[PDB]
Amino acid sequence: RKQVSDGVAHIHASFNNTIVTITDRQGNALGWATAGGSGFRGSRKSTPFAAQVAAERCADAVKEYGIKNLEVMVKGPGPGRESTIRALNAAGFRITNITDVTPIPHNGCRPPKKRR
Amino acid sequence: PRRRVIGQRKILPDPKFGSELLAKFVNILMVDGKKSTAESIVYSALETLAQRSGKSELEAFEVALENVRPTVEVRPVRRNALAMRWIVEAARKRGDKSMALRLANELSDAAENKGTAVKKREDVHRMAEANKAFA
RNA sequence: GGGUGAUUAGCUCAGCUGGGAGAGCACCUCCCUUACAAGGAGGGGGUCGGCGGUUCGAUCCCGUCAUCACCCACCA
RNA sequence: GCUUGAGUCUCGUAGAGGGGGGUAGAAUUCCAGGUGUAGCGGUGAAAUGCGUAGAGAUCUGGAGGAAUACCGGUGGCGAAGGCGGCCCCCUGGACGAAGACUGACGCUCAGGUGCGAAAGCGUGGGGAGCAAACAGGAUUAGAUACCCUGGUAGUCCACGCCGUAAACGAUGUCGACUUGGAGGUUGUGCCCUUGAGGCGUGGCUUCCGGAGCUAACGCGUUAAGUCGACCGCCUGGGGAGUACGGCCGCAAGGUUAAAACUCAAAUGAAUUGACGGGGGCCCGCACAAGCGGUGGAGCAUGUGGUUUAAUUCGAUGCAACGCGA
Ligand SMILES: [Mg+2]
Ligand SMILES: [Mg+2]
Ligand SMILES: [Mg+2]
Ligand SMILES: [Mg+2]
Ligand SMILES: [Mg+2]
Ligand SMILES: [Mg+2]
Ligand SMILES: [Mg+2]
Ligand SMILES: [Mg+2]
Ligand SMILES: [Mg+2]
Ligand SMILES: [Mg+2]
DSSP, rough: OOTOOEEEEEEEEEESOOEEEOOOOOEEEEEEEEBBBBOOOSSSGHHHHHHHHHHHHTTTTTTTOOOOOEEEEEEEETTTTSHHHHHHHHHHHEEEEEEOOOOOOOOOOOOOOOOO | SSSSOOOOOOOOOOOOOOOOOHHHHHHOOOOOHHHHHHHOOOHHHHHHHHHHSSSSSHHHHHHHHTTTTOEEEEEEEHHHHHHHHOOOOOOOOOSSSSSHHHHHHHHHHTTEEEEEHHHHHHHHHHHHHTTTTOO
C-alpha cells in the first residue's frame, strides 16, 4: 500500500550473479529479486536475459505499492548495468536519474592475488 | 562450403497438384530412387485425408506444415524441409500396417495437432523461449 | 499398560475448511552435451498404515487394533 | 707562486630525499538496529561455507586496522636499497645567476666502517584486509598442487639481530676527446609575454641511429669507440661456492675457501628446418546439416593365434588384411 509514488532501485551485478532490490530514498525496502531467483542455478545465471527476466519478476510482487517514477543506483560490473532498464522501460515507467554507485576504495584494503 | 554459395539446382514440380513442395516431399519419402512407389502411397494417403478432413487439398497439409513448423535450432527453407522430414520419421515409428495409413494417422494427430510430429517439434521449440541467452 | 503428534511414490517427507495428492533428491533409455557436469523431453512400483461411521463428496475427523518414534513412572 | 681541477659565500628554484608528530576522505570487515524474503557466494562445471535462529542486499550510528584512486606519466628525488593523501618541526643533497674568496687541497681504495628490498628471529603492542603451514570441498588414476571455502604465524609499529637476490643497466669509479635527429623535466639571459607560444645557454633522463668497436646480437657523448689512473673479479663442465679450519650470530645461516674423483664436452650469439594446449590468413567430406551403412545375426574371403606330419613364403598404422592371386 502506502502509495509511495517514487522509488529507488539498487542493482548489484557481479561476475556470476545480479541482484535487484527496491526501496525508497530513505533505505527501507519493498521487494527484491535475483537472477538465481528465476531458476537456472549455475553458469547460466550470469546472463543479461536472466537479469532482465529477474527484473520482470522484480517489478511483479511490488506492483500494488503505488510506484510511478524512480531513481537508478548501479553497483558492480557485468551485464546488469545494461540489461535492466530495458526491462524497466519495457514496463514503461520513467527513469529520473541513473547513478553509478559502484564502491571504489582508493587502493585501500588489499585484494587477493588470485586467478592463475 | 568453406568458399562457395548455393545455386540450389532446381527440380520439376508435382504432376497432378503441381506443387514444387510436394515434388520435394516425394524426393524426401523416396528411397533408392522410386518416385512411383513413393507417389502411389503419397496420393493414396492424400486422397484418404481429403475425405477425412472435408476441406481442400493443398491447405489440408499447409495446416499440417504450419502447425509443425518450429522456430529455431531459423530459416524457412530448413523449417519446411525438417517439417516434412519430421512427419515421415514420425510415421516410420508407428505400428500400423501400411505407410500411407500410418502417415494418415500421423497427419490426423497433426490435425488435432498434439501429434508426435509436434511432440518432436516441441523439444527444440521447448529450448526456444526457455534458453534465450545464447547469441 | 498412560498422553499427543504421527504411518502417505524408493527415501525423510511436506500441501488441508467435508471438493481437481505432490515441487525437490534417488533408478534406467536418446537430440544436444567433443566426454563425463548442466539442460529439457517423456519414462512412476499412490491400493494416502486397515476395519467400519458420514453427508446431494474422505489423505481429510472420530472408536479401537497394529506399529516406528517423544515425556514421566511411584511409595510399601 | 698561478688558477682551469675540487671547495666556500650571497640570492634563489624544483623535488614521493630522510626522521618525528598529527590529521582528513572513499572502501573491506565487525557490533547494534530499521526495511524486506527465500536464497547469497563460489567456479570451466560442481561442492564445502553463510541463510526461515531471517542471510545477501539495504539506509544509518559506531569500533578498529591498513593503504592513499584520480592527479601519474619511458615524470621527478636519492649513492644503493628505495621513497606517493595533507599539514607542521628538524635535516642532507643536486642545479642555475654573475661576481668575490683559499691555492692542487684532488682520483682510486684491499683490509676498515656504515647503509642495505622481501622472508625470518628476540622482547612489547596491534591484528581490518590479503595470505605460507593446516583442515575441508573439488579435479585426478593419484593431487602432500593449480580452483573454491575458511584461516595461524607474517605483512603495521617501537628497539635490536642475521647483511642476503635475476639488489639489472646482468655493463666498477673518475677525467677528457670525434658526426646527427626527435622528446620529457627543471633553471636562467633576452621577445612588442603586447600570440597558450617561440630564441639561446646550463643540469638530468628516454628513444632512433653515423663512423668506430664486438665473434654476432648489438653499444652508440649517459659507450660496449679513443685514452689515462685505481680497485674487485675469471681460468673447461661437474664436484662446489660443498666440506675442513677460522671470523660473525639466538638459530636459520652468512664470509673466506680447497683437494681427491669423473667427462671430452658444457656454454654465448646467429642461420636453416621441425615443433608450440603461439598468433594471423587460408584449403580439403577435415567438421557441422543430411542420407545410407559397418561392428550385433547367418555365410564368403583374409590376417593373428592354437594344434598338427606339413598347414610354403613375403607384405603389418593410415600407406597390410576379397593383398602378391
Ligand atoms: Mg630542500
Ligand atoms: Mg621486513
Ligand atoms: Mg613478534
Ligand atoms: Mg587461497
Ligand atoms: Mg649473491
Ligand atoms: Mg640505437
Ligand atoms: Mg672494451
Ligand atoms: Mg657452504
Ligand atoms: Mg641461443
Ligand atoms: Mg555429420
